[PDB]
Copies of this chain bind each other. A is one copy, B any other.
């Protein structure tokens, strides 16, 4: 059932919420202090570093503080398992990993590795979850955009060109094992017969090279117009849960959804502090923090703005660089503001990237009138092959073609999903870059 399913998510929300509550008691931080989104990063970093094989800020009258006191590896994850109740809560750690990657995608433009790995930099809507580490699981890849996979498989080809017996040996056999698991990730995101089918051909030749590289980036050029099933979730910093679970609100009793009204209701009534350097607009940082908690980097700035109560401008025209402070000059100049986490209306997040029967594939001109006489060129002509068939799909697909046809916005107060608010916007800069 759905209520049977949503209860599992609520238990994850409580575990992350209780951890912060035990952390604040342990870090000896005031609740106005411990409301800092700047001091919820490292309290999640460390709690997550307690698996892998930082300044806990304390501003006191006038300026900030960089007291980066360290803690024990074991006792961290001890209090964690002593907070999350029972087992080693795995989902909550992936959830904190996915939230961290959201912030990374919005703020920092991962155009770094695009030009590095030999991929046309204009593929940055696709490169979602490039940040996310290997150590993550199914969710770690489920959110990772088509650009990440194309890249994570591109490296291996050049790695195989370099070769330290890369394909050879019980080491090199264990290599191609992952490289086949990888393609089966990618193939799972593409939502066309031709795309998946092609991905198949890449893994099948477990002796890769230029030809497979050339396909991998071609497939990336395919993903801009025929977008893939890239997951999207609303993972917020644990503090917001740390106040939510402190508000006498059970999350298992109410239920929780990663794509529903719940993270909006949590974000809305939140009082989370933050910091920005001089000559950086206090609420220009708010949009970065807001977009991330909704994983809305690669999102069209139309609906990104329609959902919130204001505009959501690109990074190019923004007064903010980074979310974690830089010991490059002066610290003392820091301004403690409460960012705007609330919005006018909410919208349900989806998985597939929106796609385009015994009807007519064509037309017959009755009237002598000057126009283009349409016909479904894909279907008609469909009778490398996959290379050609794909090139015929993108040309056919128009930028003006509407997706999600029917599904609309939702009034914040509407607890259960019932209010078709499909609005108008066609008034002539959709992108965030």
Residues of A within 8 A of B (CB): 109, 111, 120-126, 128, 145, 218, 221, 223-225, 227, 230, 232, 294-300, 302-304, 306-307, 314, 316-317, 347-350, 352-354, 357-377, 379-381, 383, 394-409, 418-433
Contacts and interface: CB of A to CB of B under 8 A. Distances in A.
11 contacts: A122-B359, A230-B364, A303-B369, A303-B371, A304-B366, A352-B365, A370-B407, A370-B422, A373-B401, A376-B399, A398-B400
Nearest to A359: B433
**DSSP class of A's interface residues: helix, strand, loop or mixed?**
loop
A402 B403 contact: no
Nearest to A145: B364
A41 B280 CA distance: 51
B362 A126 contact: yes
A385 B109 CA distance: 33
Contacts of A380: 221, 224-225, 394
A75 to B, nearest CB: 37
Contacts of A432: 360
A310 to B, nearest CB: 14
B407 A369 contact: yes
Contact of A367 (B125, B350, B426): B350
Contact of A125 (B296, B361, B423, B433): B361
Number of copies: 3
B426 A298 contact: no
Contacts of A362: 123, 125-126, 223-225, 227, 431
Top 4 nearest A-B pairs by Cβ distance? Answer: A360-B431, A400-B428, A359-B433, A347-B367
A350 B370 CA distance: 12
A152 to B, nearest CB: 17
Given A122-B379, A360-B433, A433-B360, A306 B369 contact: yes
Nearest to A301: B363
Contacts of A401: 372-373, 428
A297 B366 CA distance: 8
A353 B349 contact: no
Contacts of A400: 372, 398-400, 427-428
Nearest to A112: B358
